[PDB]
Structures are given as C-alpha cells and as structure tokens.
C-alpha cells in the first residue's frame, strides 16, 4: 500500500507525451489505463492530473470503481485488454496498466462463490490462474508478418507487508516476464522507487535495454544484486579486504541518482547523460547528498550548453567515444563544482 505503483504507471504513461505528435509514428504509444477497485475520486485525480500534462489526449482510461458490483471489477481488465488489441492488431501499439489485478482477486472470488462453484484456496475459485494468465497472455509482441504492433501490460499488485509470494502474487509472477517490486519498507528512506533487486527481474533479458543501457545499465542492477550482502555487511566490517571499500562506494553515491521521483520523465538520452556518468566512476568519491543537485542541474546545464551530446544518441544511438570525452569534461568539472 502507498509505495508508488501508480506514480510509476502515471509517469510511464506520461512519458509518451512527445511521441504522440512527434515524427516517428512507430516511436509512439497509446495508453489504456484500467482501474479496478479504486474510489472514483482517486480515478478523477488521475484523469484530471493526466489531463494537466495533456496526457489524457492520447490515452483511454476505464473504471471498475468500488460502487461497481464485483463483476464489473472482474470484466474490466478483460475490457482494456480488448482496447489495446485494436492497436496490437493494427500496427499501432499500446501501454495498458491493469490497476489492481489483486483487487480483482478480491473481486473475483465473489461472483463464483455466489454461483456456488466450490471454493479452493483463500476463496479463490480454482481457476485463479486462468484468471490472471488468460489475460496477460494477450499482451504479446507482434511480428512484421503479423503486424509489428504490440501491447505492453504492467499488472499492478498489492504487497501485504512485503510478501511477494502470496497466492495470487505467485499466480501472477509465475506468468508475467519482469516484476518491478516497490517496497513501502524502503520508500521514506528516500529509496524511491524502491525496487528489490534479487526479488525482481526484467526477465526478457538485455533485449529491452537499448545499446545505451547495455553500455551503461549493464552493470547497475547486478552490481546491487550480490551487493545486498556487502551493503548489509559493511556496517560491521573491520580487519578485512582494505580496498574492498570500492564495491560499496559504488552503491551509496550511485543511490542518490538511482532514486527517481517527480511528476516528470527524463528522456532516454538524458538518462544517458546523468546515470551513465556514474557507471563510469567519475562523480563517486565526492561526498554524496549534493548528487541530487547534479541530476537536477546537470539537465539544465545540458539544455543550457550541451544540446549536441543528446543528439548523438539520435544519430548513432549509443554513447559516443567523442561524447564520452565531452560528458567526461562536464562531470569532472562538477567534482570541483562544489569542491574548494
């Protein structure tokens, strides 16, 4: 509860802004935001909010809000699935957010029990699988011979105190490819989005992460995987591997940059600007905290005197040998940008 599952989905959808009027029609995205359970005012917080960034202009939103008898809260996901399928069957593509399949979980068992269909585990009608399998299995990649279209679907799920393996979550994580875990347990610490590397994966592999991330992010996630140990060990380290400090230092500093959080998305070539600087240990050593000042200013700094660099991404489509030199010449300056 209250971990960010919708801000993320509200930023992931908001990002499609520029493309829904840009050039490359294939580099676009239509969204189908579904809401299951939610108070109809939480939904009006979104419709309006999205409308503020004009997002609503290129999105379809649908609601199965509490009032709605359990069946509506049941038929809704299967409704938005058919919304995007127009696009996944017409060249076009879509981003569908199934808001609370678990809330549909709470809302499914109802319809059946009342039908007197023998209950199984925690009321869930036996076909709890066929409920969230049958669905997701529709957001599929389309081949050129069939369309080239698509439909990406991120099913939202309620974590009870931290357990991700509960019946329904197992049911849903035993299908979907890639599960971003959001931990309330972290959140307030500043550790937002708060994703538990180790109990989450992209699954589909490096395929998604363009040459950009495969050049930078390739280290990022797994750097943190085993790091779960040393991060939870350094707090009591002494006569050990002196220099080991490096592998831990690449965590704290990096942290202040990896903690995304605002009503605004950073274009992929911008992601290439700041985060990339980190993997290429340049900022590092400097006493953190002010790092956020970088990830905010660096951008203004970019559009103020570095509009070329990003374009190289729009030309070559990776970090250049030349551009690396340049960005290097910009982040290095920031070491002493607050250093006397």
């Amino acid at each position: 509860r209250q971990t960010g599952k919708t801000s993320i989905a509200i930023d992931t959808i908001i990002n499609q802004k520029r493309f829904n009027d840009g050039t490359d029609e294939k580099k676009k995205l239509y969204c189908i935001y579904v809401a299951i359970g939610q108070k109809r005012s939480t939904v009006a917080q979104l419709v309006k909010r999205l409308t503020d960034a004009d997002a609503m202009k290129y999105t379809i939103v649908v609601s199965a809000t509490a009032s709605d008898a359990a069946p509506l809260q049941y038929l809704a996901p299967y409704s938005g699935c058919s919304m995007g399928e127009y696009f996944r069957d017409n060249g076009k593509h879509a981003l569908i957010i199934y808001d609370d399949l678990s809330k549909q979980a709470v809302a499914y068992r109802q319809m059946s029990l009342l039908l007197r269909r023998p209950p199984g585990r925690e009321a869930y009608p036996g076909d709890v699988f066929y409920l969230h399998s049958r669905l997701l299995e529709r957001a599929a990649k389309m081949n050129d011979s069939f369309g080239g279209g698509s439909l990406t679907a991120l099913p939202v799920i309620e974590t009870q105190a931290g357990d991700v393996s509960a019946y329904i979550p197992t049911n849903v994580i035993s299908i979907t490819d890639g599960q971003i875990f959001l931990e309330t347990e972290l959140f307030y610490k500043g550790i937002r989005p708060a994703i538990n590397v180790g109990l989450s994966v992209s699954r589909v592999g490096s395929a998604a992460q363009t040459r950009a991330m495969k050049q930078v992010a390739g280290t990022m996630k797994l750097e943190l995987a085993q790091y779960r140990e040393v991060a939870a060990f350094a707090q009591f380290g002494s006569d050990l591997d002196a220099a080991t400090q490096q592998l831990l230092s690449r965590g704290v500093r990096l942290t202040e940059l990896l903690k995304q959080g605002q009503y605004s998305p950073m274009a992929i070539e911008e992601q290439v600007a700041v985060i990339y600087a980190g993997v290429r240990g340049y900022l590092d050593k400097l006493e953190p905290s002010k790092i956020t000042k970088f990830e905010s200013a660096f951008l203004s700094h970019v559009v103020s005197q570095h509009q070329s660099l990003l374009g190289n991404i729009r030309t070559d489509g990776k970090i250049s040998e030349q551009s690396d030199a340049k960005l290097k010449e910009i982040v290095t300056n920031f070491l002493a940008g607050f250093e006397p």
């Binding site: 109809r40 309006k48 009032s67 809302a107 347990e185 610490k189 500043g190």
Partner: protein
C-alpha cells in the same frame, strides 16, 4: 412515494432463524433492499428484504430483536428502503438505525426522510480539489496529513486508539469548524455513546434548549443484532449527505468503526445461504466496504470531511478487514499494540501510516523531507535496535548511535498525549497547529539540540521543553 400494487403487499413470515426472517408474499413481491414492517408486534420490527428466493418469497435481514416472532406473522411492505428523517430538524437529536428517536425527546418532526440506500456520487460529481485542514496533532497532522473531504482511518485492535482519537479529533476539530457535524457510532460501546452525549451537552455542541446544535447523533450498537450495526453507519451517512447535497455544506462525519458494516456480514452472510471466504467472511466484503464508503465523499455541491475507524481482528492487519479498507483512507494510522507497551501515544506507527496529500506542494518540502528522513532514520533504526548491535545500544557506529538519540527523541516528539487522555494522569495535552514545529524538530535529525539525557524528553514533544525539563530532572556535578 411508497405504495404497492392493487394486490397484497403483505407477507406471512414462513421462517425465522436468528437474524434472518424469510417472508412470503402472494400478491406483491417486495424488492431487494426494501424496509419491511412486522405486524402483530409490540414495537417497531423492520426486516430489510435481501433476496428473492423464489416460490414467491423474499428473505429479509432483521433490524432488531427477532424475539417472539411467529411463523405466520404479517409483514408489511412499505415500498422503499429504510428511510430516515434527514434535515436540520434532526441535529442535536439522537437517532437509532431506522429513524426512531432514541435520545427520548420525542418525535423528529421533519419535512421528509431520505432513503438509506442511495446511488453514490458519480464520476463527474467528484472534485480533485484537495484543500488542507489542520488537526494540530504531530504524527496525525504533520506525518500523515489530512484534508478537506478527506478520509481518516485509524488501525489498532482493542483499545490503542480509534474512539480516543475520534474524540481527540473531535476536540481539535468537531468543536471549532464551520458547517455541521455527525457521529454514527457503529457496533462500539453504549457507554461512550452516552458520555459523548452528555459531554456534548456540558460543552454546548448539543444544546437541548435554544437551537444551536451543529452535530447529529445516529447510533446502532452492540446490544443489537447485526442487521442494525450494518445500516447504522449508513444512516449516520445518509445524514452527512443531505447536509452536503440538498443543504450545500461542508459536513464532517464520525463513524466509530465503519468496518462494523462488515462484522454485520460476518454475522449475516452464511445464514443468508452464502458460501464463506477469507477467515469465513463473505463473498462481498469488497463491494461492501466499497459501495458504502463510496458515499462519504465531496462533490460539485458540497464536501464531507469524514472521519472513520477500523478495527484489527486478532491483532492481524493480515485480516481482510483493516486491509481492504486501507484503499479508502485519505490518511493512515496503524496504532501498534507493541507500541502501547512503549507508551508511545497515540500509537501511530512509523511505516504503516500513509497518505494521498503528503506532497511538498501542500505539506511542505522541508517538512516532507524531515518526515522522509524521520522514517529513513527510523527504518535502519528498526533494524539496528535489534540487528547488528543486538538489543543493547552503545556498541559502535555512532552513525546509528545518532539514530538512538534522534529517532528515539523523534518517537517522543510524536507521542503527543493530548486532551482526551486526561483521565489517566492529567498530563499536558500537547497540540498547537504547527506554529513552532519549525527549528525544534528539524534540529534533532541534523544533530542540532539533540543530546539531552534520552528519556529526559519522553512525555513531551516541543523541543523547548528539553531544557525546560532538564531542570525538572537534571544530572551533573
């Protein structure tokens, strides 16, 4: 209008079994939700229709004792849900789960009565406008803030918060607030319900003389069957509504436990011919806490700054009762029993007390940052308190030993005893709408001021008192 067909809307009771009375109409089958009238009675026995079983027979959920009922007793079909007298002509007065005057001062002379089952505000009725509303209560106000037309909800088991905080908020709120006020006590004690009345007399709020009453009292509690505890919260809601809608005002609404709307199902489901579920519950808890709670909301005609309370069965948040409800509260406060031991009161816990109005735009960048930092330090604090050091502090790592001074003092600063706890030790009912929250608390986390003899700053929040207490309990030579 409430009028049947040109045929009998009279049904002869065919089966009584506890809180369920099946009835059978031959010339006028009465709809789901219709409030019915038991004849042959020595009082008021309304049985709310619930299902349409066939063989020309409904199935009602009895609103009061079913005692002495008889297989054959005539049941009267009114033609509409249990409809209570809604209006100004019911403020100050006390109403039971049907609109019967329970405070004893006689008839509730009213122009009309609203049905207790009404279509909730639609989607184009809603209003995004989330205007702030200060309660002047540390955690409950600063940490997890509130808001106009918002939704409060406290989470603790038996006696840790809830009723107390509802009276607390009543103090910091109910007394001073434009518009009206409502209090639908559901399930809970009749004692509190009486005192609350009298306290509402001693303090004017409820004036039996003039006509200067801003609150309304809808009650339906414990000594009653489930079919009444089920709808009472509805009436105290059918009440806040008419004040907002037809009388465009910014009401509030106190529900002493709103999930009592659920225990009612835990007591009437299976006995209605249903197949159980989570812990036994019902194939409905969802739509229930749903359909109803989707009523105490604002609109393009008025606002309802509602306030509710949700119990924690078996001390298990893992119960689909406090849980399913979470998704409705525009502010959280899961009070820990494990906290009560520590004295920390209110028992609002440093993790499970969220909000939907805590952004730097309304609550503050500085404040929300220290909040984040409070909980941040608090998290590794929850671990350190046990993990690594193993109970006993000291050890090493002053970084977290800092936490043992900061986070600890923080817990204290947030442990606001307030007025409502006056009956245990007559202690300084600390409060104050923000005002000097600046500097004081900010100091701690950064290290400014923090250092004074730990527990020397326990039963008080405002930092000023640290030195103002250092004299009370000193140490040196």
């Amino acid at each position: 209008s409430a009028a049947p067909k040109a045929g009998t809307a009279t049904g002869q009771i065919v089966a009584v079994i506890g809180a369920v009375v099946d009835v059978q109409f031959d010339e006028g089958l009465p709809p789901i939700l219709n409030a019915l009238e038991v004849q042959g009675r020595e009082s008021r026995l309304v049985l709310e229709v619930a299902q349409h079983l066939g063989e020309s027979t409904v199935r009602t959920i009895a609103m009061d004792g079913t005692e002495g009922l008889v297989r054959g007793q005539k049941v009267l079909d009114s033609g509409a849900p249990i409809k209570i007298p809604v209006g100004p002509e019911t403020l100050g007065r006390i109403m039971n789960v049907i609109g019967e005057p329970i405070d004893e001062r006689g008839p509730i002379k009213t122009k009309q009565f609203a049905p207790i089952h009404a279509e909730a505000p639609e989607f184009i009725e809603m209003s995004v406008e989330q205007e702030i509303l200060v309660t002047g209560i540390k955690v409950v106000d600063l940490l997890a803030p509130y808001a106009k037309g918002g939704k409060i909800g406290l989470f603790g088991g038996a006696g840790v918060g809830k009723t107390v905080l509802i009276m607390e908020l009543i103090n910091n709120v109910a007394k001073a607030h434009g518009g009206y006020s409502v209090f639908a006590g559901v399930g809970e004690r009749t004692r509190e319900g009486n005192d609350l009345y009298h306290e509402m007399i001693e303090s004017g709020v409820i004036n039996l003389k003039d006509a200067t009453s801003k609150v309304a009292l809808v009650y339906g509690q414990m000594n009653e069957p489930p079919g009444a505890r089920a709808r009472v919260a509805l009436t105290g809601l059918t009440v806040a509504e008419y004040f907002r809608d037809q009388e465009g005002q910014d009401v509030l609404l106190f529900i002493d436990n709103i999930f009592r709307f659920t225990q009612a199902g835990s007591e009437v489901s299976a006995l209605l011919g249903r197949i159980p579920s989570a812990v036994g519950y019902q194939p409905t808890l969802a739509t229930d806490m749903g359909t109803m709670q989707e009523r105490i909301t604002t609109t393009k005609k008025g606002s309802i700054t509602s306030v509710q309370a949700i119990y924690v069965p078996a001390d298990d948040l893992t119960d689909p009762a406090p849980a399913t409800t979470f998704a409705h509260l525009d502010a959280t406060t899961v009070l820990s029993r494990a906290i009560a031991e520590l004295g920390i009161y209110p028992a609002v816990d440093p993790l499970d007390s969220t909000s939907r109005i805590m952004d730097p735009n309304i609550v503050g960048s500085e404040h929300y940052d220290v909040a984040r930092g409070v909980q941040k330090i608090l998290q590794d604090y929850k671990s350190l308190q046990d993990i690594i050091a193993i109970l006993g502090m000291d050890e090493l790592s002053e970084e977290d030993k800092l936490t043992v001074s900061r986070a600890r003092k923080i817990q204290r600063f947030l442990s606001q005893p307030f007025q409502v706890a006056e009956v245990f030790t007559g202690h300084m009912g600390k409060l104050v709408p923000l005002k000097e929250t600046i500097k004081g608390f900010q100091q701690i986390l950064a290290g400014d001021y923090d250092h004074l003899p730990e527990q020397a700053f326990y039963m008080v929040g405002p930092i000023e008192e640290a030195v103002a207490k250092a004299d009370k309990l000193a140490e040196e030579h």
